[PDB]
Amino acid sequence: LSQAGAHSLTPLSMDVIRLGEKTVIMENLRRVYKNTDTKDPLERNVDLT
Amino acid sequence: VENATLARQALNRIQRSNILQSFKAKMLATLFLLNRTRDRDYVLKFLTR
Amino acid sequence: FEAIFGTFCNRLEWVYFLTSGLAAAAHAIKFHDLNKLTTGKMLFHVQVPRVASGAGLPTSRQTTIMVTKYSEKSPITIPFELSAACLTYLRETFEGTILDKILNVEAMHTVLRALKNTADAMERGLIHSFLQTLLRKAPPYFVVQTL
Amino acid sequence: LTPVTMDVNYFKIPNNPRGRASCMLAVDPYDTEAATKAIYDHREADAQT
Amino acid sequence: MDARAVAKRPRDPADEDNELVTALKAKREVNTISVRYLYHADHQALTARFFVPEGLVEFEAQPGALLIRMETGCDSPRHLYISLYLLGIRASNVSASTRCLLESVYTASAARAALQWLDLGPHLLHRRLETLGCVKTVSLGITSLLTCVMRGYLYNTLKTEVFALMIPKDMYLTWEETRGRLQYVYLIIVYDYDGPETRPGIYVLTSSIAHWQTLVDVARGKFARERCSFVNRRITRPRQIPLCTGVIQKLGWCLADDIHTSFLVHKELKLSVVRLDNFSVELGDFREFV
Amino acid sequence: HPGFALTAVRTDTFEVDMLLYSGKSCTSVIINNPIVTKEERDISTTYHVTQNINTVDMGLGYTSNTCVAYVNRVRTDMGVRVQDLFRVFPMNVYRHDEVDRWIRHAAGVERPQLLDTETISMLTFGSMSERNAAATVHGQKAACELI
Amino acid sequence: MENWSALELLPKVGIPTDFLTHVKTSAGEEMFEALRIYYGDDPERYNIH
Amino acid sequence: MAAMEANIFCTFDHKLSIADVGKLTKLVAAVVPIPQRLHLIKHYQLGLHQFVDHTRGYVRLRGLLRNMTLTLMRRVEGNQILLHVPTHGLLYTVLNTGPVTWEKGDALCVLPPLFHGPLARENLLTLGQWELVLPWIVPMPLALEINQRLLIMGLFSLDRSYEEVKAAVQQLQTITFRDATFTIPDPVIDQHLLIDMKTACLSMSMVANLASELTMTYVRKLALEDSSMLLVKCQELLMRLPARPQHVSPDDEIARLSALFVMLRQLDDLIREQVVFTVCDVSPDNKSATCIFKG
Amino acid sequence: ANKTLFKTIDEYLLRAKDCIRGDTDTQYVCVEGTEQLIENPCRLTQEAL
């Protein structure tokens, strides 16, 4: 599985936050769901009793 | 702008009710802004919004 | 008179799975015999570190731990459709007048737009399916922090 | 003119002085029978209270 | 036969040049007639041409009218071609105001003759009727020409427009709350056995059910009163030998989302109809039930 | 006051935004090229594009975390309105006809009425007996259950 | 009332659209006069006269 | 709107062993029913298993199967199944899943399975307590026998004593057809059989009312001058009781027979089953045949 | 549901959730897939607040 990976790589821009020597990427997927008929699965309902 | 992301066709009953409640609450809260409050962060946030 | 000041078209924001930040969580691989396989598995062999003990305490034995993992399946689909008139004007030209040429180029542009839209929908569907499964496997904050 | 026993808590929040809710944003658009039933039918519970 | 012959995928009907072009190319002779493209060459629908007198053509000028063949009981015209609207006059299901309207529309000698022939004989109505299909053309004249499809979709020469099927609103019938995705449409004639004479009801039913027995069970549930009337006449009035309480004929299939409500205009009078946008005809025979 | 002190239970539904963390190359997705399929009819044609994606999880523990970051509204009214058992058990009647009529009139309950097939469908595949109100201002009704 | 066929046939200038709400919500809630919606492929643009 | 799909892809979300896929491959060209049409469906909706219910009645299962749409299975892949919806009048290859023997030229009907032999054939795709139950494709005489047995049991159940009802159900439920023995499972009497009983009673009443004296007297008159095994076995069923016809009127006879035909059709329909296939070929091992689809 | 901790968490993530119709005035239980499932932590702790 690891040896099947791609050999070429390309640069692209994104936002990053520092979390104690761990660096992670911040992204919102608003653009993919903008005018579609499907609901964003990160917008959810939760209920309490 | 708060409810823009959930409705993806003509509004149903519950979405209309939520919009109405937001209308009433915000209209009551922000009627006379500069007489109501004078703190810096709130005014900057309001203008940004 | 009446005036038309401009006719406008919607320019769609094309998205790709590989250009998203979400793909960082993914290791994307293409497999042309994918429909041929039923299930894929991985095997793990673990032996535990050990530590000597003093008088009176029972000594720990050697133990071997072996586990297995399995894959998942989730296909996605998009239709697109064309009218018989569009196919006729795509193929056929009558008398070669200006209006007939306009209709021909209209049919060609319709099929091009349909293909572009379908490809973009496939990219979005791939992202959506990946996000769904990723959400399915993820437990909440209180569970992981307690662990 | 109101009965002396009218609920005093009714006056402590914004309400319709008529005694029943009549906001049309709650009713489906162009649904005349639903609107009339909402504002007038006293066999149907008032939406606000 | 050889391997290459088997492997060869079939010829495209559209990339082979037609017979007339083949002959002209073979002789290398020109002709004034444009020949490169043959119209209707790829219409899969089956059509027929019918002649009809001027008086009967009303509300059938627009495409989408259901066309019926009626028996006159005579040798001079033998058969006449009438629409469902004309049967609207005789049907008890239609309301009084609509009956008056479309009775004022058909004020012609031919239409009145059709009505007299229909009521004259002793047979039941369905024995006098034969369904042809849906019409999509008109060429007006003292004798008008109608072309009707009897298997297929409704569309013009280039398929640039698909025609619907128009049903008058009083005749439209549904028996399910939420429609199935695929809908079959049927023609129903049901007889009420009152004292003096039988009053026929005429309906066009849209249903998701394709099985005959289940459909007839639902129909018998919906038409219990007419079955009671049938048995009551059988008891009270011997030597009258009625047959059937109703007949059901299948004609067509359409998708539930294609169903819409609309109106028709003729001589600045408005008739209200139900509209089946992408209807395709598939005719059956009259099956009778009790 | 009657001699019991019933307690009520109800659920309120919230509309929330969630935050998900996932680790780099936590899972690998394997895909094939999309396959197209044609269906022909007289008036139009439609093309179906299908791609089957297959995924496998590549961590010996929970590799993704989720949290309920933000909530902004209550979909339900949080009311004190109690649902009628006459709707949830739509076929129980008092054995005495006059007593049944009197009880239903006092409680304000509609007369039961069902066909054979309607009853069968309701029992097997529940129907939505309660119709919507004329207007709603507080949202969905959170019906209280009493014990 | 508008000539939709002329809009479909004539060349257009491409812009990035910025509806605040969902486009179908804007249509269903009647943000605009002179709306038309159709699904799939509608051949009516092909019959010039 | 979205035109109805002719090709349906089915995917199992349960994991499949090599034995399961091997079992699936054998089922190509068989008939599988589905409740709804989509381009891509889940395996739960596939087959007759979804309707198995505590009611257990054979009649209600027969009613449910009548309303499902029939598809043929095209070739299988890994974890995928392709189904095709046949069209009226075209020619198809179909697989004989059940133990019933087919013959050239007869008509086939679809019917819920009834158990046979050791009752150990049920290896079909048991995974996650879902099972691949398929209907039987049977020739017309066997379907007519099954429906006739069910209706006769229903009619006989009325007013007969409980123990003799049990005995009649025991003797009627078993069927020998084309040198094989079958037995109907769960012959429950309920509302579904009750409606058929009501229609049968109505049709028989109307037939008895309509029939002319000539029709009634034909059998009685024939026995006075004919003699055959058919006749003597025929007259044993009847209640034991020169001249000229009291009334001759061909027009009345014609009209009366015309109505009697409609009533006989009404009675016939409740045991008739719709023909789905007509066969003209057979594999000499009876495992497969080529048929014309109709309905 | 009396199972090992990790199996319990897994079934909590997958199965131990309920759905409710989002467009009707009263809470009707929906069928999975037609719309999004709802999370209920009270299902795990077996308590009410």
UniProtKB/Swiss-Prot annotation, chain D:
Superkingdom classification of source: Viruses
Subcellular location: Virion; Host nucleus
The protein's assembly and partners: Homomultimer. Makes the hexons and eleven out of twelve pentons. Interacts with triplex proteins 1/TRX1 and 2/TRX2; adjacent capsomers are linked together in groups of three by triplexes, heterotrimeric complexes composed of one molecule of TRX1 and two molecules of TRX2. Interacts with scaffold protein; this interaction allows efficient MCP transport to the host nucleus. Interacts with capsid vertex component 2/CVC2. Interacts with the small capsomere-interacting protein/SCP.
Family per similarity comment: Belongs to the herpesviridae major capsid protein family.
Entry function: Self-assembles to form an icosahedral capsid with a T=16 symmetry, about 200 nm in diameter, and consisting of 150 hexons and 12 pentons (total of 162 capsomers). Hexons form the edges and faces of the capsid and are each composed of six MCP molecules. In contrast, one penton is found at each of the 12 vertices. Eleven of the pentons are MCP pentamers, while the last vertex is occupied by the portal complex.
Protein name per Swiss-Prot or TrEMBL: Major capsid protein
Species this chain originates from: Human cytomegalovirus (strain AD169) (HHV-5)
Full-length numbering of the shown residues: 1176 to 1224 of 1370
Swiss-Prot record, chain E:
Keywords: Capsid protein, Host nucleus, Virion
Localisation per UniProt entry: Virion; Host nucleus
Keyword Mitochondrion: no
InterPro entries linked: Herpes_1
Any one GO MF annotation of this record: DNA binding
Keyword hit for 4Fe-4S: no
UniProt-listed GO biological process terms: viral capsid assembly
Stretches of the chain forming a coiled coil according to its record: none
GO cellular component, one term: host cell nucleus
Source species, domain of life: Viruses
Quaternary structure (record): Interacts with TRX2, MCP and capsid vertex component 2/CVC2.
Function noted in UniProt: Structural component of the T=16 icosahedral capsid. The capsid is composed of pentamers and hexamers of major capsid protein/MCP, which are linked together by heterotrimers called triplexes. These triplexes are formed by a single molecule of triplex protein 1/TRX1 and two copies of triplex protein 2/TRX2. Additionally, TRX1 is required for efficient transport of TRX2 to the nucleus, which is the site of capsid assembly.
Family: Belongs to the herpesviridae TRX1 protein family.
The protein's name in its UniProt record: Triplex capsid protein 1
The species this protein was found in: Human cytomegalovirus (strain AD169)
Lineage summary: Viruses, Duplodnaviria, Heunggongvirae, Peploviricota, Herviviricetes
Curated annotation (Swiss-Prot), chain H:
Coiled coil: none
Keywords: Capsid protein, Host nucleus, Virion
Family: Belongs to the herpesviridae TRX2 protein family.
Domain of life: Viruses
Keyword Magnesium (UniProt): no
Annotated signal peptide: none
Cited function: Structural component of the T=16 icosahedral capsid. The capsid is composed of pentamers and hexamers of major capsid protein/MCP, which are linked together by heterotrimers called triplexes. These triplexes are formed by a single molecule of triplex protein 1/TRX1 and two copies of triplex protein 2/TRX2. Additionally, TRX1 is required for efficient transport of TRX2 to the nucleus, which is the site of capsid assembly.
A UniProt-annotated Pfam family: Herpes_V23
InterPro entries linked: Herpes_capsid_2
Name assigned to this protein: Triplex capsid protein 2
Origin species: Human cytomegalovirus (strain AD169) (HHV-5)
Oligomeric and partner information: Interacts with TRX1 and major capisd protein/MCP.
GO CC, any one term: host cell nucleus
Localization: Virion; Host nucleus
GO molecular function: structural molecule activity
